[PDB]
Symmetry: C3
Subunit: 118 residues, 3 copies
């Protein structure tokens, strides 16, 4: 599973390392992936590139997650709830977090030299 | 509804503020979203990082839209035509604009503390 | 077909012109787009922004493909196998390449002034 994290540079860079491990812990606890399978890409944005809603603050953060289809709604909902709860101490409140999950068949993936369904 | 706009930095940077309001008005018009929910991320690109078809110009621009499933094809097509019509004053002709819309279930989203279906 | 390519800037920048033609050759070989329909975006990343698995090297490269629905699994699988085989000369091993393909209907696309299902 691949993660992409977006946020203003000035507020995402100080917390980049701890946020990485916390997101990885949610991947392990809600979806049972081994901790060493961490796949994250961060995109710190300048203020002129980030047009977020005015109801939110400069700490507004977006996580996009691509993974196999076939997991239940309950597990995907558990992951969303873990992400909201565990980013709180980083200064990212529920209003300042947004998550989107995309699911594709395993035969659309390739890793370690074979299609995903193989 | 998240949008991501890609273009050459040389030509996207001078116009991204107007283009942002133009794009926001198409969301409001074709999809009835309030202007307050503007959610956009701009990605100005280097020339060596952007390989686009040779029959297009340096003003080539890509818009990626991610939203809930459930809107009609007619509403999505009205959005595509409004984007083509309205970015044209900014120097983006129809050859230089490409739009892709991705849709996912509501329970795949996390925003404001809860899975989207709640 | 839109392609996004990610990797550390140290190793993506010197090879990306060669990587661009190699990827475009795999799209033409496996899915028969004309080579003039190349559509790629590269994102060279810094060290503090790329958290890849530790069983992988600094050469780890990610390729995302977004295209129309309708191509067969066999065609998509051949595209995956070709990408793995052809990125070898540029020093990217099988463990260091990951591919993801997203499909959407044609009416979800806009290009050349019209929705994709009207051309």
């Amino acid at each position: 599973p691949q993660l992409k994290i977006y946020g203003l540079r000035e507020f995402l860079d100080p917390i980049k390392q701890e946020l990485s491990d916390i997101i990885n812990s949610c991947m392990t606890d809600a979806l049972q992936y081994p901790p060493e399978k961490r796949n994250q890409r961060f995109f710190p944005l300048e203020r002129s590139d980030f047009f977020y809603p005015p109801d939110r603050t400069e700490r507004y953060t977006i996580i996009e997650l691509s993974m196999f289809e076939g997991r239940s709604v309950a597990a995907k909902k558990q992951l969303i709830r873990l992400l909201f709860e565990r980013v709180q101490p980083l200064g990212i409140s529920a209003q300042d977090l947004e998550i989107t999950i995309f699911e594709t068949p395993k035969h659309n993936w390739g890793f370690r030299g074979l299609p995903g369904d193989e």
